Amino acid sequence: SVTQQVFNFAVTKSQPFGGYVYSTNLTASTSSAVTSTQLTPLNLSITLGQITLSGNSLVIPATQIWYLTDAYVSVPDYTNITNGAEADGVILIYKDGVKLMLTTPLISSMSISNPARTHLAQAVKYSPQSILTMYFNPTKPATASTSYPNTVYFTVVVVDFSYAQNPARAVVSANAVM
Amino acid sequence: SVTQQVFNFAVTKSQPFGGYVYSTNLTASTSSAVTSTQLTPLNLSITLGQITLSGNSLVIPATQIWYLTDAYVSVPDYTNITNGAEADGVILIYKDGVKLMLTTPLISSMSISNPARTHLAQAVKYSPQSILTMYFNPTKPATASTSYPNTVYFTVVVVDFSYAQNPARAVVSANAVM
Amino acid sequence: SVTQQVFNFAVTKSQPFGGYVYSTNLTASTSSAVTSTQLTPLNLSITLGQITLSGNSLVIPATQIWYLTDAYVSVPDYTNITNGAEADGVILIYKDGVKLMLTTPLISSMSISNPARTHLAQAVKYSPQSILTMYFNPTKPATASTSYPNTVYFTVVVVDFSYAQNPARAVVSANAVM
Amino acid sequence: SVTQQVFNFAVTKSQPFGGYVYSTNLTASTSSAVTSTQLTPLNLSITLGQITLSGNSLVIPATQIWYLTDAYVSVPDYTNITNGAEADGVILIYKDGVKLMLTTPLISSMSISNPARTHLAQAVKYSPQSILTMYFNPTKPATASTSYPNTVYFTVVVVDFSYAQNPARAVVSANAVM
Amino acid sequence: SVTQQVFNFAVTKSQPFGGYVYSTNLTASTSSAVTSTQLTPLNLSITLGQITLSGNSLVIPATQIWYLTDAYVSVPDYTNITNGAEADGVILIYKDGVKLMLTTPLISSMSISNPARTHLAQAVKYSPQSILTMYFNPTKPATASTSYPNTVYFTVVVVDFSYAQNPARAVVSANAVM
Amino acid sequence: SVTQQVFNFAVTKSQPFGGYVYSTNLTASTSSAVTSTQLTPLNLSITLGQITLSGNSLVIPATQIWYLTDAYVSVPDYTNITNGAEADGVILIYKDGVKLMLTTPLISSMSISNPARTHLAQAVKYSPQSILTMYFNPTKPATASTSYPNTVYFTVVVVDFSYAQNPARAVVSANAVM
Amino acid sequence: SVTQQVFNFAVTKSQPFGGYVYSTNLTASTSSAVTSTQLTPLNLSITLGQITLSGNSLVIPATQIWYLTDAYVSVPDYTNITNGAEADGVILIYKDGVKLMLTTPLISSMSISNPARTHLAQAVKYSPQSILTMYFNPTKPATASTSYPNTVYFTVVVVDFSYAQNPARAVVSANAVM
Amino acid sequence: SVTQQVFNFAVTKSQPFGGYVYSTNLTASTSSAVTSTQLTPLNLSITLGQITLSGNSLVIPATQIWYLTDAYVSVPDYTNITNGAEADGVILIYKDGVKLMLTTPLISSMSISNPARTHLAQAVKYSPQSILTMYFNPTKPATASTSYPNTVYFTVVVVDFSYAQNPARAVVSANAVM
Amino acid sequence: SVTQQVFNFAVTKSQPFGGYVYSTNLTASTSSAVTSTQLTPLNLSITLGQITLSGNSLVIPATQIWYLTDAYVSVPDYTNITNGAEADGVILIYKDGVKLMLTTPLISSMSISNPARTHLAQAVKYSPQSILTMYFNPTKPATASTSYPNTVYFTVVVVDFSYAQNPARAVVSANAVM
Amino acid sequence: SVTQQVFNFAVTKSQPFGGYVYSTNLTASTSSAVTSTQLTPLNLSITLGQITLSGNSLVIPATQIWYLTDAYVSVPDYTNITNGAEADGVILIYKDGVKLMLTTPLISSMSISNPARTHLAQAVKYSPQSILTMYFNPTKPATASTSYPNTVYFTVVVVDFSYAQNPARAVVSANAVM
């Protein structure tokens, strides 16, 4: 009931200005078998129109207000972490490339097969256009042969404004009142 | 008890117009071992009078209001996802065949045995007559031999006005307030 | 479970003075296989400064206000505890070398694999320069041959003030109101 | 939440007289593999300064107030109990060596891993100088070979007054109010 | 002392609105051995949080104001220009894809090994998002075998508004004062 | 004459509070033939008394205000740079570990034998206690055998208040004014 | 040297309430050849009638007020300290477990054959029932073979109240004025 | 008795604000057999809660006031100095790393056995948070084989305000008075 | 460059009191090939008396007011620096044996052959009798065999007062006004 | 406790005018094996700036007030005087080269190896500018071969005034009241 509170906060504020609140799934994936030092995962979001906003350092579109709210790791990735087939570590979340926002507590320990997995500390918002970039700082890297790249899922509440009566300036008038 | 916030809201508003409020369970089953790409699951609700609306794209009757409130996965299915005996992925939830409203976070995550299980994002009101349709976009599909089809359960609160004095002007007066 | 409330407490208090609120990860580790008596865990914090504060007895920098919030234990540490490969016990938390303000409840009982994973009582403040130091009081020490050192990951809420007008005047005014 | 009400009550009440409230852990250890009849467990409290007040019949010092709030049994101890590697039974909690106040319900049942763990009945206040002592009444003793001593953990809220002023007036005034 | 003239202008004009001014080294490099005609150097600016804005025709992020101030040529380039290992020529500097504002005076004469290096004509400011592209118009191109690409270093002053209490409309409000 | 305005400002402003202004040299030595990646230079400052404040991360004393004004490179070091006996690159200047304030423009370019030597962009003020640290990012690193360490000299304007009166009130009043 | 001032202070204040003042010898001895880290000495007091309170953490009787005044070290210890047969260091003196009240100045410098035999600073008053415990902090520990335990004798001024008209109401009225 | 004039000064001034006064022993130990030139000893204080503030450059916490009162040398060190087994010299005592306050007169002279031992020159008040560091400038260094490191003991009176009602407002009102 | 202004300042100010103004030559030379650490240069001043003032620590005579203005390094020294025949570094200028007021900027860069020969920032005053003394701080010291000592020539403006009515009362009246 | 009185007398009088009281160490060394007649020792004070103020007949600078308060002779010197390896005798202490102020009693008898060594008679002050010079008048000179020079350490309290607001008549105002 952590994402259900920012969702319910969004739909009562985006209603008098027009606003299409819906939830998506964002997948950050560090490419090709991290073994030494700080690397860069490829952010990859899925909006409505089957459009894959991929590549490093996503810019939020000019009419959307995002909220990064949750994270979890699948079972076949967690079975690769403890067996030494992919690296453990944390994930650093940067806003505008400069300002640090959060740090994920040890992606092996927010796996989904454990009944008391750890959480994030806050729901990180992102205004109209800003540069979301993430970095994966590894500890205890990959040791076994035929190792695998990392994958960490997120969950974004997306507040769209493209279908308002004038989708140019309501998206920052509603950015202030939020 | 996010259903019980919706349940106690439906008994409170649909009572002066006369209205039968009860909860039932909807079954969306992607058939025959999804292994490649986007498919479409068969919705199957259980309404009151011994009838079962099967098939895709459930049409809401003109005297009823539905509410999709929660979702989970059975424990023998969560055994089969992590074993590679059936496919993982997300579920897209549409309204009137067009409007995307939800994306369930990676159905391996919402197994009912975990107390730290990520739920649905928000309770979706489904109006009088309006098409409910779902799709299943697979990621990490089924790999092992003797695979099984997928099943994802839902909890639906159904409000009914077919036993009032006038079923027409009871619905159109309660759909605006509630 | 308290780490979401003191994060929201530092945001609405540091905004008139101006300053970050973010989170990081702190690792405490008693070296080399405790089997007899009270040993010293090596604190190790990383900040946005990209400088690792290692060894015992961390000193909080002059523009930051730390908040010690939660703690967890990974699964292969918890498999070591039940097999006697490492020691159980509690962790004591000191301030300024004199005061003792907490006790972590039995580091096996806060493992990530217990469905009743227990948390801390209240968040511990740390003003500009003060001394964070910890001690491990082992009950039921390690019995098996080829033991392993302990590791308990903490969670800090860090309230930076480095980007104000003058952080020497700002950080001692927000230290009073928080 | 029975320790938290006691903790907030002790922080609110013992503040204006000057009072240092914290929480520690108490260990009751029935040594040497009890197999026949009623024994006496060795108490051991770990206070500030690694003093480790050990042995039977802990005399509360003349400036502190103790609050025996909750009790549990660690998970390897529960594994040893249900395999018959250590004895089961109840724990009798006495004040001044004559007056009985509590009997803990069957220490196998209060393992910390269960969410349905039976708690202690009430938070027992121990005033300045007074003799806490406990006894262990065993039912179904240890039958398997390589038996282990019993260990039961308690949680104490220590309210110290030595640092404030003349501690005599502070202790008698706080003991009058709270 | 022309870089320090607009740097001091930046820190006194973006200070009442809140603005974090700093300097940054920029790189523009014509790839793979220009030999006949007009080419295009690949820009590369590294803002502080290790995001690398690369490729031709950079876009300015939405909260920053840039000032392109200095340019020079390193000594391993200048030994290669006069020996016919790479091309001479000029560099044209555009903004918004329409405006020409500068031409660098014959980059071999902008080398740093000469005690009378010639400078640019004016410090070119750069608004929030506006395309910054450069072109290499060579005279006397590369002659000898084993030719090398060109490299021309710049020096840009970056004003940053990431830490204010207003979104990217205070940035253009401070672009109206500068 | 960028150091002289800082000197006249420190003489004029710090005189009524009692203030001893002088100028000194700081040496940054990146040791042991940097050839691959980003390294850390050994700082070494010589204030009054032959204290030789050495090592990384010089903390400013709690009674002084520093002013990093200019930087240069000695002429045999420039000879070693242009022949590939030591690495070229930039130096990033940090305050309190997080705040990047300057990047020195390509230390080969700031040889002291050139009258057209590029300077720093601004004289950076360091308040009372704060962590001054630098980093060396090499571009076109050292290639020839028998390589040499890098050395970059800075000019510091030290404004001392320790010998005047009670130095705390004086240094905070001065840091408020100038 | 401070014993003669508090003995005259004891016999003056304790006579209006009934007062029975004498002195005795306390023996503190860390067992078994301290060589690495902080040890716990075994206290042993000698009261009147073959009442030899022993073990760690002595508890004061309910009718007496102790005063810990001086200490000394015999010659067969001091010839073992200088030859490396036992450890040097200081002794820490606690009260109620929490307060640290003194530090004995370097037990090899309190020997009975030093012509400048150092004494304690002020005598520490000990109330009715209150845990007196000590701790030994070794610097330059034992290095030679066939090492020996430590023994440091003290001097206690005991103010007994057993022969007053009421031995309970007399002490807590004289403990307030002494 | 220069400490007893300071100890009775600290308990008189810090009493209306509420403040813990006690004495400890600080150890300055130059590591590993100084034989050539100026070195730096490792300061090592022993505060209340069993901590050992080791390492160079002791930082005073924001609630404490320190007083450096005397200095001496243990008798097995004085035997090693005069036989040429460790080095002689003086000791410099700095405040905030810059301001020299004392120079101890030739540490071979201040042996604790001589009644005509030259003491420290003055009792130095060390203000709240402020660096303490020492250096050892040797004359007649260590010559004999199997040499040993140095150790010079100090006596520190610690005034502590961490147990007052407001530890911020207590120190800054008592640092001015005391 | 300042040596013509302080000459013209000294002439127009001493004429109400009557006095010589003339310029001399000061030679500071470290003995015997500095290769490791901080050495002492031997000052050697010549005056109108045909009198050398040799050795360290020149004392200004009782009726003169000196002014240390500029410095330079001859070409046969500057060819020795680049070939590693003597040490680089800076020269510190002390007054009264306590105060530091200048640091000469890198004696290679004030050579007579550098086209940007740098000067001293401001002139150093010296009253009636005070102790001028200097120290040489070597960075990048001499490595080559058959090394050479350093020699750095200065320029002193001498204000003699021996031709007034009384040279003792005149020089203490002009020392205040100049 | 003789130097601690003149140190306290200085800081009570140097406080209202400004002033930096600190303790030093003076080393007088009659060079190269005095065997016949009256010699002159090389005085050598070590001030704050690590200034080796060498040479015969030190001059007190115009802003300092010294106090010669102590003398002692080390243990390796005293074993050479009795062995006939260097000369015994007294040291004459002259003011301005004219006045005789004191005479030390037989420098072999102010050794530090003896528990009740002799002292000086009075603490000799020194005003602004005056010539402190010493002479060594030997009785019983060195007799055996391989002789050594003499060395006698002193202890100077130096009252400095160079950092006052006007160090020209503050030192002549405080010279009167002292």
CSV table of C-alpha atoms in Angstrom, one decimal, chain E residues 1 3-5 7-8 11 20-25 48 70 72-77 112-117 119 153-155 157, chain F residues 2 70 78 81-82 88 90 94 98-106 108-110 113-122 139-140:
chain,number,residue,atom,x,y,z
E,1,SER,CA,41.0,36.9,-17.9
E,3,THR,CA,36.8,33.3,-18.7
E,4,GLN,CA,36.8,34.9,-15.3
E,5,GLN,CA,34.8,37.9,-16.6
E,7,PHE,CA,32.2,33.5,-14.6
E,8,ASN,CA,32.0,36.4,-12.2
E,11,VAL,CA,27.8,34.0,-10.0
E,20,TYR,CA,25.3,26.6,-8.9
E,21,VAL,CA,28.0,27.9,-11.3
E,22,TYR,CA,31.0,25.8,-12.3
E,23,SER,CA,33.3,25.3,-15.2
E,24,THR,CA,33.7,22.3,-17.6
E,25,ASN,CA,36.1,21.1,-20.2
E,48,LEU,CA,29.6,16.6,-13.4
E,70,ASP,CA,37.8,29.5,-24.6
E,72,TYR,CA,42.9,25.8,-27.6
E,73,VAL,CA,44.8,22.9,-29.2
E,74,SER,CA,47.2,20.5,-27.4
E,75,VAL,CA,50.8,20.0,-28.3
E,76,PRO,CA,50.6,16.5,-29.8
E,77,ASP,CA,48.1,17.9,-32.2
E,112,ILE,CA,49.1,26.2,-26.9
E,113,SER,CA,52.9,25.7,-27.5
E,114,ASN,CA,53.3,29.2,-28.9
E,115,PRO,CA,53.7,32.1,-26.4
E,116,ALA,CA,51.3,34.3,-28.4
E,117,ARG,CA,48.3,32.1,-28.9
E,119,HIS,CA,41.9,33.8,-28.7
E,153,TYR,CA,39.4,21.5,-26.6
E,154,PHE,CA,37.0,24.1,-25.4
E,155,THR,CA,36.1,25.6,-22.0
E,157,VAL,CA,30.9,27.8,-18.0
F,2,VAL,CA,43.2,38.1,-10.0
F,70,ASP,CA,45.5,30.3,-9.5
F,78,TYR,CA,55.8,20.9,-19.3
F,81,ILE,CA,54.3,16.4,-20.7
F,82,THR,CA,54.9,17.3,-24.3
F,88,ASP,CA,48.1,15.1,-19.4
F,90,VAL,CA,42.3,17.8,-16.0
F,94,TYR,CA,35.8,19.3,-4.8
F,98,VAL,CA,30.2,16.4,-3.3
F,99,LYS,CA,30.4,19.9,-4.7
F,100,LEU,CA,32.4,20.1,-7.9
F,101,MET,CA,33.4,23.7,-8.4
F,102,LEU,CA,36.2,23.8,-11.0
F,103,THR,CA,37.9,21.7,-13.7
F,104,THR,CA,41.4,22.9,-14.5
F,105,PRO,CA,41.7,23.4,-18.3
F,106,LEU,CA,44.2,20.7,-19.4
F,108,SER,CA,49.7,21.0,-20.2
F,109,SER,CA,48.2,24.4,-21.2
F,110,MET,CA,49.0,26.2,-18.0
F,113,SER,CA,56.7,30.0,-19.3
F,114,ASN,CA,53.8,31.2,-21.5
F,115,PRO,CA,52.6,34.7,-21.1
F,116,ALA,CA,49.4,33.5,-22.8
F,117,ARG,CA,48.8,30.9,-20.1
F,118,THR,CA,45.2,30.1,-19.3
F,119,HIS,CA,44.2,30.7,-15.6
F,120,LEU,CA,41.5,29.3,-13.4
F,121,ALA,CA,38.0,30.5,-13.9
F,122,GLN,CA,37.6,31.9,-10.3
F,139,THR,CA,43.5,12.3,-21.2
F,140,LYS,CA,46.3,11.1,-23.4
